[PDB]
């Protein structure tokens, strides 16, 4: 029937190819956790360098869409780079056309709208990637937003993507239900504890990559291995 | 309880309850319909209720679903209807086997033999049940007739009721006289759908009112004078010669017509003679034709009065003449059955009333007018089988001119209908009896006065008649071969194809 082969409706009313695209995000085997605190938003992803020959600097899943906006990409790497390039172009065009930096919510909608086109048209396959965008909104404070291959986008207090997303979301839900607004140290701790618990890795500083945006410093910053180590050592002594 | 929701008098029934009850009456695709239940007692309650649901007040025909449910209820009833008993007596031979089964040892429970009093009680109950079933059947016809005649009933419900009434034709009993009057009167109902339903019903009523014809056993060897050879020789033989059509053999006299055997069906005599061969009784023994209407039974009188009236026939002829589908219309053998029944039962009593209409219909070249006359002509010829020589001769003096004009006026639209009329008229008949028609179409089929195509159509109508009489016309086939042989090199393509087929 070609219902499974291309993005057309099934008898049940479901598009299987989008569901297959979601399976692709897990195929990479990496998990990303993003948490929104009272004054900051943080992204942590597991980074695995399979070969000693590979240069460590080149392998990254955290990218800077704009000076104040950064993203984490989970899924096929080449598809991830394609979405990152599209987001960067959209952000520049918005500043040129409207004279102000694109809001994180608006950028997630633009990428999600491009994603819907792939679901509607048979010739183009959906991209098997998840984009989590973190930024500080001047009006509404720290913002975490996630885009899907289906073209759905939503704002999240905390969110996860990857092989352990279902397990990661469960750990995050318990912390969000209890506790209170978290300080920057607590928000970085929550993300690292969540990834550590699901993957049982006891991460050394090299294994995890951390990206942060704060109300005090809106610009996106990737923490250095020493800064990640300081968070890890504090977590160990607790 | 389900019928209460669809009762017209009941108030506060609601749209939902009425729709649900109709679904319960429709039943599952597989399972109990609940409206087509075999017992008469169940059918008598359900069928009138569905017809009278039109006046319910909880019925909205405007909603499409309600109309779909009513159409489905009628369709399911029509497809799954089976005739329901009316007599259930068991033969004595069966009871004798049953008595032995009761008196069988091994897997046996000791039981007293049925008392003579008990056996009598069973006969009384069965007789009461069969009488009760007949009472219900007459009531169902009467109650359905009351429903269709309701002052303010939606048209769809009247159509559903007339279809249910059509299902009640019995074949073991004549229809109640009131119903016979309704169907003959509704022959000219304004709706074509009701008119077609009436045509089918009245043809069935005519078979019910038919009077049986006596038959005489005959010895084929004695009439032929041949020895009747023991070996199963097949094909033309000395014993089968009388059946063959010969110009000298054709009776052409009152005395000769009575003397001739007139076998009828083509199959008889070709392979072997039947152990008992029946040729029909003499005219005196056969039921008297030309009754005065005082003699005719009340049911026959109802059909006679309507058909005899000039106005009723004029309306029926106009309704029959009207086109229904352009280029999809055909002979409609049900119309032929109605005319054949009328002519066979009434012996050309209505022939004078129909005569002015037949002449006008033949003259008109319209495809519809020609089709209507063709059905009447085929029925008139087929209905003439048991008519006396004086009556048959009169029919042919009127028919020979009308057929000649019709064949002359044959056209692409009406050629097939005329072929059907000749084939239906010829089928199941003795060739010698139909000599007038055989001479009429064989005189000059390729005259060329009409032109090409008309000649091919005239050859085609003749071919259909010759095909129906198989092996019983050794001559005529020879005469056609002689006529065709000179014209074989002088014909156009349309005629050539027809000559090849013949």
């Amino acid at each position: 029937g070609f219902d499974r082969h291309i993005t057309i409706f099934s008898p049940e009313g479901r598009l299987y190819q989008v569901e297959y695209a979601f399976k692709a995000i897990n195929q990479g085997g990496l998990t990303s956790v993003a948490v929104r605190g009272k004054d900051c938003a943080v992204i942590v992803t597991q980074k695995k360098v399979p070969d000693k020959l590979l240069d460590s600097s080149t392998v990254t899943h955290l990218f800077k869409i704009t000076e104040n906006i950064g993203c984490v990409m989970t899924g096929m790497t080449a598809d991830s780079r394609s979405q990152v390039q599209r987001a960067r172009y959209e952000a520049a065009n918005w500043k040129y056309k409207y004279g102000y930096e694109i809001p994180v919510d608006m950028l997630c909608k633009r990428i999600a709208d491009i994603s819907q086109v792939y679901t509607q048209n048979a010739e183009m396959r959906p991209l098997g990637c998840c984009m989590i965008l973190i930024g500080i909104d001047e009006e509404q404070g720290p913002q975490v937003y996630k885009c899907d291959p289906a073209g759905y986008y939503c704002g999240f207090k905390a969110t996860a993507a990857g092989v352990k997303q279902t397990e990661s979301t469960s750990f995050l839900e318990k912390k969000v239900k209890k506790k209170f607004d978290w300080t920057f140290e607590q928000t970085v701790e929550t993300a690292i504890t969540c990834l550590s618990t699901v993957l049982s890795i006891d991460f050394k500083p090299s294994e995890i990559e951390v990206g942060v945006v704060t109300v005090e410093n809106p610009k996106f910053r990737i923490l250095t291995e020493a800064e990640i180590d300081a968070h890890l050592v504090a977590l160990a002594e607790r | 309880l389900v019928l209460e929701f669809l009762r017209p008098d009941r108030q506060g029934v609601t749209q939902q309850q009425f729709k649900g009850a109709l679904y319960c009456l429709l039943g599952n695709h597989s399972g109990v319909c609940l409206a087509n239940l075999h017992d008469w007692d169940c059918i008598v309650q359900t069928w009138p209720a569905i017809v009278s649901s039109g006046l319910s007040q909880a019925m909205s025909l405007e909603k499409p679903s309600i109309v779909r449910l009513f159409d489905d209820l009628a369709e399911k009833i029509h497809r799954q209807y089976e005739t329901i008993g009316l007599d259930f007596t068991i033969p004595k031979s069966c009871v004798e086997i049953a008595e032995l089964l009761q008196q069988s040892k091994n897997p046996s429970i000791n039981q007293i033999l049925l008392s003579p009093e008990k056996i009598k009680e069973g006969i009384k109950r069965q007789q009461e049940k069969n009488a009760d079933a007949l009472r219900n059947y007459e009531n169902l016809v009467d109650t359905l007739l009351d429903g269709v005649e309701q002052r303010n009933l939606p048209w769809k419900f009247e159509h559903i009721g007339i279809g249910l009434l059509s299902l009640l034709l019995r074949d073991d009993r004549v229809l109640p006289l009131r119903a016979i009057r309704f169907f003959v009167e509704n022959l000219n109902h304004d709706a074509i759908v009701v008119r077609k339903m009436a045509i089918s019903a009245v043809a069935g009523i005519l078979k019910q009112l038919k009077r049986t014809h006596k038959k005489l056993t005959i010895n084929p060897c004695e009439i032929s004078g041949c020895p009747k050879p023991t070996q199963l020789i097949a094909g033309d033989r000395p014993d089968n010669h009388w059946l063959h059509y010969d110009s000298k053999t054709i009776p052409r006299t009152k005395k000769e017509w009575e003397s001739s055997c007139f076998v009828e069906k083509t199959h008889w005599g070709y392979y072997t003679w039947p152990k008992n061969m029946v040729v029909y009784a003499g005219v005196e023994e056969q039921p008297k034709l030309g009754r005065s209407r005082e003699d005719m039974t009340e049911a026959e009188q109802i059909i006679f009065d309507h058909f005899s009236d000039p106005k009723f026939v004029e309306q029926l002829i106009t309704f029959l003449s009207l086109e229904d589908r352009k280029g999809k219309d055909k002979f409609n053998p049900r119309r032929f059955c109605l005319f054949k029944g009328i002519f066979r039962n009434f012996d050309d009593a209505f022939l004078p009333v129909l005569k002015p209409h037949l002449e006008h219909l033949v003259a008109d070249s319209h495809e519809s007018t020609q089709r209507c006359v063709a059905e009447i002509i085929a029925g008139l010829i087929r209905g003439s089988k048991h008519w006396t020589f004086e009556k048959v001769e009169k029919l042919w003096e009127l028919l020979c001119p009308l057929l000649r004009t019709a064949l002359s006026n044959i056209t692409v639209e009406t050629y097939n209908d005329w072929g059907a009329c000749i084939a239906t008229s010829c089928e199941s008949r003795d060739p010698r009896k139909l000599h007038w028609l055989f001479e009429l179409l064989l005189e000059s089929p390729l005259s060329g006065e009409g032109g090409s195509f008309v000649d091919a159509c005239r050859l085609y109508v003749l071919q259909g008649g010759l095909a129906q009489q198989e092996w019983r016309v050794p001559e005529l086939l020879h005469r056609l071969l002689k006529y065709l042989e000179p014209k074989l090199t002088q014909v156009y393509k349309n005629v050539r194809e027809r000559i090849g087929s013949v």
Partner: protein, 217 residues
């Protein structure tokens, strides 16, 4: 097959979250269920009920990304009419234009039909208007309609509750009741999104306003 694809698109709408529209003498109310799957989701981030113009608003049951494409087109169509005629677009005119875009997707090949059914409320010439548009491109005018899961059950409930003369405040209460019938859990101001159309024009009721109506029920 294009017709089969339309039937399949209708199935996706039926599987979609329940949405209810009620038209009353002074206003039209559009109500939808927005149950966030997890405590993690931010309720205020995304809105199911969206304004097309000052006097026109729309709600949907079905796929949300597909719904967004239609809302952008609908907002553009409203602006194009305003530029040419310098008057707010009649709601019936907008629904006809929105329907044409959905028909184009069904007719064309290599593109699936939209999987979203749209309920559009508008106020023009002092008369309330409520309309429903299908993936097929068909549009109907409804005094009350329910779309999404348990739409058939919701529509029958609407038949008993609806009165020809109703105030908008009463209409809001019945619309919430229709959603309550098919709501799996407790209904809260965050869980349900409600939009009202009046002489003032389409507005999305603030969560504080929704809380007051929920308390009354």
């Amino acid at each position: 097959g294009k017709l089969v694809q339309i039937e399949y698109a209708l199935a996706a709408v039926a599987g979609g979250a329940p949405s209810v529209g009620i038209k009353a003498a002074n206003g039209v109310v559009l109500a939808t269920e927005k149950k966030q799957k997890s405590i993690l989701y931010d309720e205020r981030s995304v809105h199911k009920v969206e304004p097309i113009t000052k006097h026109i608003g729309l709600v949907y049951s079905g796929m949300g990304p597909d719904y967004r494409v239609l809302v952008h087109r609908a907002r553009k169509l409203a602006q194009q009419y305003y530029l040419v005629y310098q008057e707010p677009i009649p709601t019936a005119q907008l629904v006809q234009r929105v329907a044409s875009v959905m028909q184009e997707y069904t007719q064309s090949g290599g593109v699936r039909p939209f999987g979203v059914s749209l309920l559009i409320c508008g106020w023009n010439e002092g008369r309330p208007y409520l309309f429903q548009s299908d993936p097929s491109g068909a549009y109907f005018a409804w005094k009350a309609t329910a779309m999404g899961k348990n739409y058939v059950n919701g529509k029958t409930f609407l038949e008993k509750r609806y009165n020809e003369d109703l105030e908008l405040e009463d209409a809001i209460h019945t619309a919430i009741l229709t959603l309550k019938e098919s709501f799996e859990g407790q209904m809260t101001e965050d869980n349900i999104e409600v939009g009202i159309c009046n002489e003032a024009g389409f507005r999305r009721l603030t969560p504080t306003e929704v809380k007051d109506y929920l308390a009354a029920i």
